[PDB]
Design a binder for these strands. Sequence first.
RNA 1: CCCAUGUCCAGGUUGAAGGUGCGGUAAAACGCACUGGAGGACCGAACCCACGUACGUUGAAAAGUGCGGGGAUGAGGUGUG
RNA 2: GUAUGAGUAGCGAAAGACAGGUGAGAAUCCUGUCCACCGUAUGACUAAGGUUUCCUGGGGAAGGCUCGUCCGCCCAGGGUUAGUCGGGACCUAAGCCGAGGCCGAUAGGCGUAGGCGAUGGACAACAGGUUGAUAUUCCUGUACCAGUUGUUUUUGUUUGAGCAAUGGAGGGACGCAGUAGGCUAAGGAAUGCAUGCGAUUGGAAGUGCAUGUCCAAGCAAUGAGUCUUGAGUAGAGUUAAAUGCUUUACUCUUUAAGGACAAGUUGUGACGGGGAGCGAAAUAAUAGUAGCGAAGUUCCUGACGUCACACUGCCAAGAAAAGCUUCUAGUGAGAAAACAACUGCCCGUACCGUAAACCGACACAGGUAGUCGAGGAGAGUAUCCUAAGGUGAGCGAGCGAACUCUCGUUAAGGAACUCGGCAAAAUGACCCCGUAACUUCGGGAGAAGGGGUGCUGACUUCGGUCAGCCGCAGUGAAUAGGCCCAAGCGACUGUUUAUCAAAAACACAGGUCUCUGCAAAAUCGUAAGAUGAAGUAUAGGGGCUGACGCCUGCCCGGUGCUGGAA
RNA 3: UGAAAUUUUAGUACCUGUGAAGAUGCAGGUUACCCGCGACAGGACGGAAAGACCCCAUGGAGCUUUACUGUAGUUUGAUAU
Lengths: 274, 43, 91
Amino acid sequence: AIKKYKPTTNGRRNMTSSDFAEITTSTPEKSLLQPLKNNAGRNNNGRITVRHQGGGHKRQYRVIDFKRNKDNVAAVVKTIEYDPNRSANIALVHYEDGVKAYILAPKGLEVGMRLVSGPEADIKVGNALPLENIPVGTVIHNIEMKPGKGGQLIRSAGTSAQVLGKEGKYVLIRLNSGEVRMILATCRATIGSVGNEQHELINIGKAGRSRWMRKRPTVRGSVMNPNDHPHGGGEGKTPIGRKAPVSPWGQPAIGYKTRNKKAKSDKLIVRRRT
Amino acid sequence: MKRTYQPNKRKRQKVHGFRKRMSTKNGRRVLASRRRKGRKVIS
Amino acid sequence: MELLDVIKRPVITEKSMLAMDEKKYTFEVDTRANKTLVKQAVESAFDVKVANVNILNVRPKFKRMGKYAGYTKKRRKAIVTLTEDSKEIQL
RNA sequence: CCCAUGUCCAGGUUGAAGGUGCGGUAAAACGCACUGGAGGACCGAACCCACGUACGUUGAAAAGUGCGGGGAUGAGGUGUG
RNA sequence: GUAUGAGUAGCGAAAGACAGGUGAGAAUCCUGUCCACCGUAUGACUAAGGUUUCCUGGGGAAGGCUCGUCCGCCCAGGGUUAGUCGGGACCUAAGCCGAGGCCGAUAGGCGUAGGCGAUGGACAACAGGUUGAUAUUCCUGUACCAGUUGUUUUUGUUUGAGCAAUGGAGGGACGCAGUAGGCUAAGGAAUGCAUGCGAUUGGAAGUGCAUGUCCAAGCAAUGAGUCUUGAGUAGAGUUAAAUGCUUUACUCUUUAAGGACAAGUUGUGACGGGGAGCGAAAUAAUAGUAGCGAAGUUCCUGACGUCACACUGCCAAGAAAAGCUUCUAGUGAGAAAACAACUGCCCGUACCGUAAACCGACACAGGUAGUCGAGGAGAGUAUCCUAAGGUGAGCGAGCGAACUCUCGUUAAGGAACUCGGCAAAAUGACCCCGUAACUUCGGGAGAAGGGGUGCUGACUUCGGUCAGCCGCAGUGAAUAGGCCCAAGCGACUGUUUAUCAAAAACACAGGUCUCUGCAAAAUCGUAAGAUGAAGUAUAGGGGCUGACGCCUGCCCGGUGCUGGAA
RNA sequence: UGAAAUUUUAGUACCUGUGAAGAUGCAGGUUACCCGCGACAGGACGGAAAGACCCCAUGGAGCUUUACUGUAGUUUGAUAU
Ligand SMILES: [K+]
Ligand SMILES: [K+]
Ligand SMILES: [K+]
Ligand SMILES: [K+]
Ligand SMILES: [K+]
Ligand SMILES: [Mg+2]
Ligand SMILES: [Mg+2]
Ligand SMILES: [Mg+2]
Ligand SMILES: [Mg+2]
Ligand SMILES: [Mg+2]
Ligand SMILES: [Mg+2]
Ligand SMILES: [Mg+2]
Ligand SMILES: [Mg+2]
Ligand SMILES: [Mg+2]
Ligand SMILES: [Mg+2]
Ligand SMILES: [Mg+2]
Ligand SMILES: [Mg+2]
Ligand SMILES: [Mg+2]
Ligand SMILES: [Mg+2]
Ligand SMILES: [Mg+2]
Ligand SMILES: [Mg+2]
Ligand SMILES: [Mg+2]
Ligand SMILES: [Mg+2]
Ligand SMILES: [Mg+2]
Ligand SMILES: [Mg+2]
Ligand SMILES: [Mg+2]
Ligand SMILES: [Mg+2]
Ligand SMILES: [Mg+2]
Ligand SMILES: [Mg+2]
Ligand SMILES: [Mg+2]
Ligand SMILES: [Mg+2]
Ligand SMILES: [Mg+2]
Ligand SMILES: [Mg+2]
Ligand SMILES: [Mg+2]
Ligand SMILES: [Mg+2]
Ligand SMILES: [Mg+2]
Ligand SMILES: [Mg+2]
Ligand SMILES: [Mg+2]
Ligand SMILES: [Mg+2]
Ligand SMILES: [Mg+2]
């Protein structure tokens, strides 16, 4: 659920957070861990390529089976766990052959619940089926785009796709963001929503807590100098003395679309919202 | 009042060293200019 | 290198004489040398059975004569401690 | 500014959630105590910073000293690479 | 090059005085006695950096802001000893290089394998002495790690003991805060104990004065205690195998038992060494130096040092790799222990190190990582005075003018000064009482405002309390808030023009709009390639606003954008 | 013991006036033995600095844009692969 801290201090005033009711352990598995270098927006060349990042708490990477290659071998849930690299929670599963693994803990999942994959699999949460073998109307998550690449699309919190039809070799899929799309039918997906629908509600209350979340400060270009941003400069406080407010480069900020108009997937996209 | 030269043998030789200069191409020019000049301290 | 060019000379000093009176002798050595080579060298040069060998390498000592300044050469000084039931090297 | 790896923050204080018990209830909201020990919380050394003032202003100093000053478990200070 | 200013400013924060000595010459050097300064340091370790500044013996040409017989200066000599300390012959992070390869006017850029690379991980020693200068290094004892040869005792010889992988597994292996608790440094130096001595200034041979009031590493045993349920069937899998590892069901046990882990304690080590002090000639012992050597208890306090990230809680969810253990695959006729002996490389090791040796042009009032850092009073590393120990500031003497600076008092008044209460003054610790408007019910609040505080006896059930005494005054000194009323700005903690602006400026949580379906969008770059992301619309990027509350009206004609289409 | 800035030479008075228009130095008149010490700071249009205000230069640099001319990118099409 959500915690609502009392207002002892002006930082803690209107803060909220999660009580982490759905988590059974703070004790992850020593095998599925890998390290993370925080890049802080820097790149191969050391230059800032993505602003407003870096400087927070250390993290590890938790190897997750988005692919679900393993078929006709069940897997029983033991624990739900915090993953800092994402918004959602995760879950530990032992395959009966003894393989340990993490997966993306869907909504309505509980310890002891048992999961499978393949066409013979059943229409229940946590089970990874190809879009061939999934009926219309069902909510899914952990969708992939190319077979064997692994789940790409529906992996974050409180997200929910929905099958809506087919066209032969493809499947028609509504996504979060309202976009309808044709997706290759042999792509695997898992049933249900993704997990903690309450993460959207968390107020943060502290700049320092944003820092812990690795988010540097955003500086506005209406205050920078003219060399620094196209909105910079001006005596006193300046409006946007331009048409089409812009990025630090010449890209407009509002309205200008950025999808390549040569995109091969435009034939697949049926109805887009964004 | 802290100052600009906080010495360090390691940083000095890792930046301004023979290995570094001879590794880069444009350090080959520097060293060869110490010699044409006729330096006793090539690095 | 060769065992006799390993060793160069002894070090006649007060400390070294005080060590001679405790049965361990100082020797200047090739700067590229090794402790086991000093051992082999003395054992072949005196038929004395060596017990232990210490080594120092001395920095070059600044000097000057008029306008011109420079450095004394580097040195390596071994200290060869002998056994009992052994001879005492005569210098 | 950032990456990794380490390290430092005397002492004292206040007393959030949660929990327990006793009331009260048809049972609860609720209340009273105790526990607990949170905080970009408080006072204040080192540490960090530089608000004012005087002095210095061919300075002890190519930006300081003194008298006070602000922060001081964090968005902290600092070291090495 | 030499004048001018001018023999002027300055001689760089602070306490020295005296007697003797050395010497041509003494405020300045040496010895000594008093005195003062530091003491969470102005002390003792030590990384970096410096790189010979260290020690001895001479010197006073220059340097030292004076002098100088002296020095971190000059001259001649010497000085740094490691199987165990730190680093390499061990491991790897960030980052770097990079076979081949990819990309590219050239040059080259990127990057895989594989390497490098500590600030981390792993890794076998410590007590004393000793030099003029080195000390876990040298010396004496006592060990420990890896290895070699030999002797002795065992057992394996190919249905084969043992070694055993780069292969499989485990382990290594980790955050922040918060208290309890145990143990031990440490301290009181309270107590006893040992040694020495009765003070001439009025008193004291006693509950007088002073000083001290120990010892490893290793071996053995023990252990405050702390973690962890563990055994067994049917199995599936562990790129092939496996007695090892993982796990699905199933039974029994779970205050338990078993298995690990442990600070520390005791006995040895130790018939040794240290140690108050006493104290040798033949004297460069021109001694306090060889040398000799007592006792080393009890009680109280008591550590975030350690057990130990052990436990609890929390969210921001907290390196890896190798050593190490096991498994077999493989290999295999030699291996295990006891004893004796032997071997163990390379670099650093001096000295400075909150500084006159580093960085600042200087022997510069600046800055310089970490460890130890005692006592009384005290919560305390604050503060005052002291301990161990270390210093006495590299110009002085006198006279005690104006004026400048740093300080201290002040009649009466009390902000009349002033741009302005600037500066200074006043308050300041602890205990108790008491404490408003307003409020996001948390606060405001240490509000305000008051009172008390010393000493000596009784008294408690240990803090209150009573009585008495003294002073102008009792946190008697030092160290510690001035407060209140109201208004504007910004909500807040924070950041900001290194060197004239600390702010109402920036950020901030929050809000909104917009883009983006994943080879994203955006960005760096010729491109490869990379960030974004080892993320995936509750995610990310960009613009604006800026906590919270009530709100956020009308305008799409214009300029843009989006979509459309004859 | 031992500098520095500055410095055309200097035996370097005052009033009034003159004068590149505000004189230690020219004039007329007046006052004033020579040399110093400590203090002050009215002047030497004092020192420091080729005015930063202003104007000029067919000077420069940064910045803006519905100034000009271009261009990297973005996009559309033709053609080749
Ligand atoms: K290290
Ligand atoms: K103290
Ligand atoms: K319009
Ligand atoms: K004047
Ligand atoms: K211009
Ligand atoms: Mg601005
Ligand atoms: Mg612009
Ligand atoms: Mg305006
Ligand atoms: Mg503008
Ligand atoms: Mg050595
Ligand atoms: Mg605070
Ligand atoms: Mg404070
Ligand atoms: Mg510091
Ligand atoms: Mg300022
Ligand atoms: Mg003068
Ligand atoms: Mg001085
Ligand atoms: Mg102090
Ligand atoms: Mg000396
Ligand atoms: Mg002199
Ligand atoms: Mg000398
Ligand atoms: Mg490269
Ligand atoms: Mg690598
Ligand atoms: Mg008497
Ligand atoms: Mg030393
Ligand atoms: Mg001095
Ligand atoms: Mg008065
Ligand atoms: Mg007035
Ligand atoms: Mg004031
Ligand atoms: Mg007081
Ligand atoms: Mg007004
Ligand atoms: Mg503010
Ligand atoms: Mg502030
Ligand atoms: Mg400033
Ligand atoms: Mg704003
Ligand atoms: Mg004029
Ligand atoms: Mg005139
Ligand atoms: Mg004339
Ligand atoms: Mg004079
Ligand atoms: Mg002038
Ligand atoms: Mg000019």
